[PDB]
Design a protein around this nucleic acid. Structure first.
Lengths: 452, 70, 123, 314, 297, 391
RNA sequence: UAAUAGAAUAAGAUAUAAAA
RNA sequence: UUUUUUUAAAUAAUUU
């Protein structure tokens, strides 16, 4: 590997990333790429902008942080030579700097945003999609650039210069940024309709998912999407079935003729369901509101054999969905509680509160999960809303927890947001339960606020 | 200090580079060896950069002509 | 924003006229202002020419005389950013409205083209 | 769950969750039947058990590896663009956002590549296991010392086991590796021979630390904590300073007296400690042994993701 | 070779073209889509660039800005298109973005009373042929002749003046060379007159003359590559048969609405030839256009 | 083996206990690069200490190339080193010499900075008159090497250079011509006038001047063909004795200009292939390409050129396999041995060829009869299946 | 004391919100 | 079926 110059290293790093993010995650390719990229330096050699951008991208993708040398040298080069970063290597730099969060990364992202804003009128079919996806990866709120790019996308799509993959990328990129524009999504839908047979199921499912996520509240296109998807049910995979379940729960409109066929196909492939698919299906059923015990029994049974496969998110969603519908499965609940006790350090800020409240709402108390979640609450108290804090406090009061080292953070958080805490009517009953346990002695100022 | 012995050794090395001197180049090498080994801990513990650089230059230059490595 | 083949297509032409009328009200009082930079003058003149507003000759003479000092400063000082395309546009506008308005500006401006003081847009 | 297409190859937020060792410094760990190459001679073991300390005959790292490790240590103390994963550290001298003439870091094996890899280095872990009577050896914690040039201070006499009173049995060892060439004018380690067997394996009283004072008094405070017999053994065997190269390693008993000199060269000096602990080790109280770590109860065996097993004689 | 076009602005499309004929805006948009697709399906054009819509319909005539004579990109005088200056700057930004020339030659603009337009010049073999109509004066003739005409045994460039009447359209709309030896002319009075004048000026010249029907707009990318793609209007089938009979490739295109507004195919596209600067002795790679290993098989 | 005094000095330098200025480190590095008797390059603990001494010293004392040389001699051993960037002069440090030194430092040590270029240019304009004629040419060369897009300032510099036509010599004229031709945005009027000045003083030109002028004309394009005419006429009396690189440049300019007077082309090609055996790999490739593009490969032409290229055919660069492979096609001459050796070399480097080069090679070998019965088809098939993501 | 350049290339789910 | 734009804009208020 020593006789390879920096250009060949960049090409092979791009090849390794493409092989790893697409054809399996072989833990061998990742570690070999890490070892090779740990001993490379852009120093004393003249390199093109594209090679430096490729090295930065493939380094950052493989875990390298903003403290590594290669990353620092590439970022310094991107800062010093700004006019050499044309509109062809702008997406690579932006994608690489998306996850890096430092001063130089912010400055580079802003400079590339302004450059793409100025040249938004002279881009072609590839560049608009690549740039908009790259800017959707990072969290930026440059509205004017989005407007210019949407205008250019409409102008290009009027003449018909987009394929199925381009449509999926554009729809996902514009849905991820929460940019609600009716004309742009209408144009994308019309371009897909003109494409006709060139969109297959694999290129159709993400379109529906993104169109539901954006939330246009247009019942004219939802029906057309449902009718188009009705013919493709027999070819779908289990993951696709769960994806359309979630998408048509996001839409909010009831299509019984579609839901029945979806349920039949889901029952057909019950052996291929992982825990993620079961959690997604149960969350979609909770959101849409339909109550179908026949599929629910099979989903609960299949969830019982893949208990070890459950993540924190899957446990949270499954338990909340099961508790909302009033389904009792003592073995599944016990196994899920034990597993949640095992991985208590993987719960995020809101997943912990949802899991604790779902477990406390039904009469199921287990010390193994209770102690773990109560201890873990300290590190997620600071990232909570008023209603979420109220739910967590009620669940903790139901578990009979009295350790001050646990109760001080949640009481501080609920005192800091007292106005929104006491202005939510739906939780009023819960309030009267909480102070029924702790009493006026615990945090007197909160009691004084409660009396007023 | 050590700068004086350094510059005198440099003068010897220039003399060897140009010609051989009245006594001969081998005698010059012997005198350079003695002057270089004259240095003790006091000066080399208080020598600045130029003197050390010149001493290494002269010693490396004379190591090619000496039969032993040194 | 007016469509010649929309729902109110038959009402398109009168509305256009109205707009032109309210342009002239602004166009008549175009000599009291003081232009800081050439792009302001060029934008105003592009708007009036494209939309075919009528402007009295006095304001035109004031505009061209004001632009003359700026182009002369740019030509003479050369130490201080009028690009070449902007200068072309100004020359063409003066030619369209007649070179009798400002005889000095035409000759100075042509000489600027001949020498090459004005840079390009790429630079 | 579902990991996004551009986040598939990332590493965990902290390197503690990474099972095994990354291939960064020396590639992959050798096979099960390939761990006999790194064994050490019995005479080194006898020298350690006699003097309380010993030096490994061979440097444990190539010079490129030492350069990379020095770069990591330099980046751990940026003070303008703070290190990522700084919140994964047990303690730092930059918690005040100002630093100083001495930078000390702990628990950095969960923060940077290479430092995590250095823990599972075969040459040192096999030696430490041999010192610990061929048992499973678990990392206790690491430490990094960086002293500035022309003003770097010196840490006075101390005993390592004085800081580990919350741990019940005496089953430990320390390995110190030099990331820069060291000598008595820049942070050399000075140890007293035969001091680990003075107070019947006991702990001497802590020394009085008075900063803003010359190095001579700081290193001469030793005559205040010892008794007459320890004074006689000191007179027979005065403390010895050890010179270290850019990669040489030194094994120290937990109970031997230990100090480091000041830095009077023209560049900063770096060194790294790693403390290794035996299998049969229990806790004494209820709670976490280190800030924000798994909590133990009564005499519980010390395991978990925070004390990984680095080597197994089976 | 890069071809530049501009999309129509639907909201401001005229209701009734000159002469009072009617136009349908949806069909105009559809026909421009068909034109863009047909241009992209051409093998010779390396890239087709699509500029953003501009408020006026006259912005669809992008070919009026400049002309390509040999290696010189001459900018047309800005005497009658004062409202189109900004559109010309915007087009030049597009040209620069694609790696083309930094700026245009201003030889014609400096000259006084030099009226001319892109479209009266025909890149004939061994030089250009200009037409002497009302839209261009004699000053343009003299300036072009002094700039580009050189007489030599080999470094020879020929400029021809072809007289035409007041009502005749620009020369490029009806008199043009195609293929390598084929002269395509409208079976009209002006076409026959131009053919006769070209034959006379250059005697002892052998090239077939093909007569199309009047009103049949056409476009042919004339170059060394000898591309035979000749775009013609859909309605006229006899011109199509004639072009096919000469050994060419007619590519039918629906051109009704654009014709009804006064815009032809030649006035809707801007063809330019770019190259890459070769620092140091250098010979950039060129794509092949012939067969390989003829001798073996 | 290090004796006592030598060992003690080595230890003192190892411990960073000696203050070294830039001059002393430069002298020590020069001694090490010249003579290897004491094993300076063989002690990592010694060169590491020297590098630490170099980082904390003032490098502004020495010339830019001395710093570049110290960096290079540290890189060769295995230490990643980079000389410090020079700060833009401020307040009274303003002078033409320092403003030239900033560009020279950025040039030699490979640290290009657009912001510093723009700042320097914005501060050198007022004093452009005080500049000496040689400093103007130096600034033009430096700006041409840094690929600056500020063509307006380069044009101003070129005009002030033309105003001193009498002072400048042939070498300076050629350097100005090529450096102006390299800038992309330069106005064509200044280019025409500079080529006019180059047009005269034509007999004074030297082989380096000829190379510079031919490079500039190749960069410019057909629009200046007339000037190139007077060049080929000028060299018509020296053609029997010229350097091989000069004749290669002549062929490149002939191909680019689309010259049509064939007698000069034939004479120059005939003179070139007499000494074509002296050409390097790259120049040989370009002579072959330029001769192919001019339709001049007869039987003896192709035989001689193939015999000359078969020597480098053993270790061809990957970028040069495809062009000669294309030239071997489209010609009715026997090239079996060259084809076989080139295919073997292509097989050898199948794991470093980029996607474009692999596609080009597969295209060129697509219709070749003897290319079907070879391992290259299978190896390239596997490589293409692997690389389909990058195509 | 130190100055020579070539390549044009596209992957895709973070637990929200009222009217031609 | 189609509906979108091109300023250098500088006047809020406070003891946080």
């Amino acid at each position: 590997v020593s006789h390879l110059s920096a250009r060949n290293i960049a090409t092979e790093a791009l090849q390794m990333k493409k092989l790893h993010q697409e054809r399996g995650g072989n833990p061998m390719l990742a570690q070999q790429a890490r070892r090779v990229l740990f001993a490379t330096s852009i120093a004393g050699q003249n390199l093109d902008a594209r090679s430096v951008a490729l090295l930065l991208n493939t380094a950052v993708y493989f875990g390298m942080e903003s403290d590594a040398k290669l990353v620092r040298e590439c970022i310094d080069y991107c800062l010093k030579n700004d006019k050499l970063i044309t509109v062809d290597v702008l997406p690579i730099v932006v994608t690489a700097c998306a996850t890096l969060k430092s001063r130089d990364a912010r400055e580079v992202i802003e400079m590339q945003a302004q450059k793409a804003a100025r040249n938004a009128k002279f881009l072609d079919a590839k560049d608009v999609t690549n740039i908009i996806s790259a800017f959707s990866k990072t969290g930026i709120n440059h509205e004017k650039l989005f407007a210019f790019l949407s205008r250019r996308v409409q102008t290009l799509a009027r003449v018909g210069e987009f394929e199925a993959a381009h449509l999926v990328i554009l729809a996902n990129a514009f849905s991820r940024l929460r940019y609600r524009d009716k004309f742009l999504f209408g144009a994308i839908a019309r371009r897909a309709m003109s494409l006709r047979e060139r969109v297959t199921v694999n290129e159709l499912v993400p379109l529906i998912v993104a169109f539901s996520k954006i939330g246009l509240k247009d019942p004219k296109l939802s029906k057309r999407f449902a009718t188009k998807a009705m013919e493709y049910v027999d070819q779908m995979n289990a993951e696709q079935v769960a994806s359309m379940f979630m998408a048509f729960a996001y839409f909010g409109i009831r299509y019984d003729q579609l839901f029945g066929v979806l349920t039949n196909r889901a029952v057909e492939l019950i052996d291929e369901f992982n825990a993620q698919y079961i959690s997604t299906t149960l969350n979609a059923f909770q959101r849409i509101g339909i109550n179908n015990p026949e599929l629910f029994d099979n989903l609960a049974e299949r969830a019982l054999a893949v208990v070890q496969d459950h993540d924190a998110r899957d446990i949270s969603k499954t338990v909340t969905a099961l508790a909302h519908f009033g389904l009792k499965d003592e073995e599944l609940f016990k196994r899920l509680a034990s597993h949640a006790a095992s991985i208590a350090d993987q719960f995020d800020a809101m997943g912990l509160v949802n899991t604790a409240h779902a477990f406390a709402r039904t009469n199921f108390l287990q010390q193994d999960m209770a102690v773990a979640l109560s201890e873990r609450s300290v590190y997620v108290c600071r990232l909570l809303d008023a209603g979420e804090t109220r739910r967590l406090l009620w669940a903790l009061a139901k578990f009979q927890v009295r350790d001050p080292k646990i109760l001080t953070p949640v009481f501080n958080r609920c005192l800091a947001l007292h106005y929104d805490f006491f202005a939510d009517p739906t939780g009023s009953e819960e309030i009267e339960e909480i102070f029924d346990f702790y009493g006026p002695n615990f945090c007197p100022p909160l009691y004084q606020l409660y009396i007023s | 200090t050590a700068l004086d012995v350094a510059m005198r050794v440099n003068k010897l090395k220039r003399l060897h580079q140009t010609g051989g001197g009245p006594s001969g180049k081998k005698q010059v090498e012997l005198d350079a060896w003695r002057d270089l080994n004259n240095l003790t801990e006091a000066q080399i513990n208080s020598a600045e950069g130029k003197a050390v650089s010149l001493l290494l230059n002269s010693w490396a230059y004379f190591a090619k002509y000496w039969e032993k490595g040194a | 924003q007016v469509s010649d083949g929309g729902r109110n297509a038959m009402n398109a032409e009168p509305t256009r006229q109205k707009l032109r009328a309210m342009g002239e009200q602004i166009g008549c009082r175009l000599d009291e202002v003081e232009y800081p930079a050439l792009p302001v003058i060029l934008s105003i003149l592009d708007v009036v020419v494209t939309l075919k507003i009528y402007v009295p000759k006095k304001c035109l003479q004031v505009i061209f005389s004001q632009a003359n000092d700026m182009v002369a400063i740019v030509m003479e000082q050369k130490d201080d950013p009028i690009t070449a395309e902007e200068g072309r546009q100004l020359q063409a506008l003066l030619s369209h409205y007649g070179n009798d308005l400002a005889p000095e500006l035409s000759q100075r401006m042509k000489e600027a083209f001949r020498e090459g003081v004005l840079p390009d847009e790429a630079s | 769950s579902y990991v996004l297409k551009f986040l598939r190859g990332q590493l965990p937020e902290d390197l503690k969750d990474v099972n095994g060792a990354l291939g960064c410094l020396y590639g992959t760990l050798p096979d099960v039947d390939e761990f006999g190459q790194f064994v050490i001679s019995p005479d080194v073991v006898n020298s350690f058990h006699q003097f309380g300390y010993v030096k490994m005959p061979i440097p444990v790292l190539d010079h490129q590896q030492i350069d990379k490790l020095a770069d990591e240590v330099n980046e751990l103390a940026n003070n303008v663009e703070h290190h990522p994963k700084t919140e994964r550290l047990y303690a730092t001298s930059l918690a005040d956002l100002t630093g100083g003439p001495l930078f000390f870091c702990q628990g950095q094996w969960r923060a940077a590549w290479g430092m995590h890899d250095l823990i599972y280095l075969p040459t040192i872990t096999v030696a430490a296991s041999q010192i610990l009577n061929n048992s499973l050896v678990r990392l206790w914690y690491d430490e990094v010392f960086m002293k500035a040039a022309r003003t770097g201070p010196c840490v006075p006499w101390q005993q390592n086991y004085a800081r580990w009173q919350h741990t019940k049995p005496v089953n430990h060892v320390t390995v110190m590796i030099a990331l820069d060439t060291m000598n008595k004018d820049r942070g050399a380690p000075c140890l007293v021979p035969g001091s680990h067997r003075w107070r019947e394996g006991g702990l001497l009283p802590p020394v009085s630390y008075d900063p803003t004072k010359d190095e001579a008094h700081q290193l001469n405070t030793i005559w205040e904590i010892i008794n007459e017999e320890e004074g006689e053994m000191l007179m027979d065997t005065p403390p010895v300073t050890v010179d270290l190269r850019r990669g040489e390693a030194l094994l120290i008993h937990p109970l031997t007296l230990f100090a480091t000199h000041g830095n009077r060269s023209l560049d900063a000096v770096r060194c790294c400690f790693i403390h290794y602990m035996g299998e049969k080790t229990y806790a004494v109280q209820n709670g976490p042994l280190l800030p924000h770590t798994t909590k133990f109860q009564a005499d519980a065996m010390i395991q978990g993701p925070f004390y990984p097993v680095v080597f197994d004689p089976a | 070779l890069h071809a530049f076009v501009r999309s129509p602005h639907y909201r401001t499309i005229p209701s009734a073209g000159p002469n009072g004929i009617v136009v349908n805006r949806d069909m105009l948009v559809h026909q421009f889509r068909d034109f863009y697709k047909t241009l992209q399906h051409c093998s010779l054009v390396d890239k087709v660039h699509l500029m953003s819509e501009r408020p006026s319909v006259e912005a669809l005539r992008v070919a009026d800005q400049m002309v390509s004579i040999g290696a010189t990109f001459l900018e047309m005088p800005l005497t009658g298109m004062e409202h189109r200056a900004t559109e010309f700057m915007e087009s030049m930004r597009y040209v620069r973005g694609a790696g083309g020339p930094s700026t245009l030659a201003s030889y014609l603009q400096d000259t006084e009373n030099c009226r001319c337009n892109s479209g009266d010049v025909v890149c004939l073999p061994n030089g250009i042929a200009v037409g002497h109509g009302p839209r261009t004066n004699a000053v343009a003739h003299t300036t072009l002749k002094q700039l580009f005409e050189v007489k030599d045994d080999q470094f020879s460039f020929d400029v021809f003046t072809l007289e035409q009447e007041g009502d005749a359209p620009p020369l490029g709309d009806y008199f043009g060379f195609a293929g390598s030896n084929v002269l395509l002319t409208w079976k009209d009075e002006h076409g026959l007159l131009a053919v006769d004048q070209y034959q006379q000026k250059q005697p002892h010249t052998e090239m077939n003359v093909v007569y199309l029907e009047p009103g049949c707009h056409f476009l042919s990318f004339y170059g060394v590559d000898h591309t035979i793609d000749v775009l013609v209007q859909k309605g006229y089938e006899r011109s199509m048969d004639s072009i096919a009979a000469a050994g060419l490739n007619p590519i039918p295109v629906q051109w009704s609405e654009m014709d009804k507004l006064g815009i032809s195919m030649r006035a809707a596209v801007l063809p330019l030839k770019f190259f890459k600067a070769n620092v140091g002795g250098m010979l950039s790679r060129n794509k092949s256009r012939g067969a390989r290993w003829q001798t073996h098989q | 083996a290090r004796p006592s005094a030598l060992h003690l000095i080595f230890e003192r330098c190892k411990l960073n206990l000696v203050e070294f200025t830039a001059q002393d480190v430069y002298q020590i590095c020069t001694t090490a690069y010249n003579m290897d008797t004491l094993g300076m390059l063989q002690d990592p603990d010694f060169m590491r200490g020297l590098h630490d001494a170099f980082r904390r010293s003032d490098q502004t004392v020495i010339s830019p190339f001395q710093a570049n040389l110290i960096a290079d001699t540290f890189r060769k051993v295995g230490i990643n080193s980079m000389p410090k960037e020079v700060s833009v002069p401020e307040e009274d440090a303003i002078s033409p010499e320092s403003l030239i030194l900033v560009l020279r430092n950025m040039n030699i040590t490979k640290q290009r900075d657009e912001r510093k270029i723009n700042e320097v240019l914005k501060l050198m304009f007022p004093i452009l008159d005080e500049f000496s004629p040689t400093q103007l040419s130096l600034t033009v060369t430096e700006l041409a090497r840094l690929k600056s897009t500020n063509a307006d300032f380069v044009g101003k510099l070129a005009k002030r250079i033309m105003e001193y036509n009498d002072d400048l010599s042939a070498l300076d004229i050629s350097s100005a011509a090529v450096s102006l031709a390299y800038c992309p945005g330069i106005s064509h009027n200044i280019l025409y006038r500079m080529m006019q000045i180059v047009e005269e003083r034509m007999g004074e030109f030297q082989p380096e001047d000829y190379i510079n002028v031919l490079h500039a004309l190749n960069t410019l394009g057909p629009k200046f063909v007339n000037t190139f005419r007077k060049i080929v006429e000028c060299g018509l009396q020296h053609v029997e004795n010229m350097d091989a690189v000069t004749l290669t440049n002549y062929m490149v300019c002939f191909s680019t200009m689309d010259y049509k007077q064939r007698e000069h082309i034939d004479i120059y090609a005939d003179a070139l292939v007499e000494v074509a055996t002296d050409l390097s790999e790259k120049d040989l490739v370009m002579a072959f390409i330029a001769l192919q593009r001019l339709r001049l490969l007869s039987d003896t032409m192709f035989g001689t050129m193939a015999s000359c290229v078969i020597r480098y055919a053993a270790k061809m660069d990957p970028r040069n396999i495809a062009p000669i492979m294309d030239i071997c096609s489209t010609v009715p001459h026997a090239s079996d041995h060259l084809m076989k050796v080139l295919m073997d070399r292509a097989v050898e480097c199948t794991r470093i060829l980029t996607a474009n080069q692999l596609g080009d090679i597969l295209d060129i070998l697509g219709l070749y009869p003897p290319a079907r019965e070879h391992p290259l088809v299978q190896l390239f098939g596997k490589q293409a299946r692997l690389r389909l993501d990058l195509m």
